[PDB]
């Protein structure tokens, strides 16, 4: 049962990259439809930046 | 002393919450002040009604 490199770099580390990205998007949800600071504009929201 | 906001600990809306407050207290106490100025228009006589 040779490789095993990848097999987790195939299965585990790739799906962990996908869901790690997803939770990383859940660290930018911030519950605001909208609000921001925006030197030029409104820019709606902190979501955007 | 509602809108003294280092804003915002709500943050809802980004300085638009008190608009809803004096909005709604405008609304409910409006129809009460209506009759209170209508019934109570006779009890709002041509004296200090001004």
From Swiss-Prot, chain A:
Disulfide bonding pattern of the chain: none
Top-level taxon in the UniProt lineage: Eukaryota
Protein location: Cytoplasm; Cell membrane
Chain's role: Component of the exocyst complex involved in the docking of exocytic vesicles with fusion sites on the plasma membrane.
Quaternary organization: The exocyst complex is composed of SEC3, SEC5, SEC6, SEC8, SEC10, SEC15, EXO70 and EXO84.
UniProt record similarity statement: Belongs to the SEC8 family.
Protein name from the UniProt record: Exocyst complex component SEC8
Origin species: Saccharomyces cerevisiae (strain ATCC 204508 / S288c) (Baker's yeast)
Gene from which the chain derives: SEC8
Range covered out of full length: 582 to 630 of 1065
Swiss-Prot record, chain B:
Subcellular location: Cytoplasm; Cell membrane
Additional remarks: Present with 4280 molecules/cell in log phase SD medium.
Function per UniProt: Component of the exocyst complex involved in the docking of exocytic vesicles with fusion sites on the plasma membrane.
Quaternary data: The exocyst complex is composed of SEC3, SEC5, SEC6, SEC8, SEC10, SEC15, EXO70 and EXO84. Interacts with SEC4.
Family recorded in the similarity comment: Belongs to the SEC15 family.
Full protein name: Exocyst complex component SEC15
Residues of the full protein shown: 406 to 455 of 910
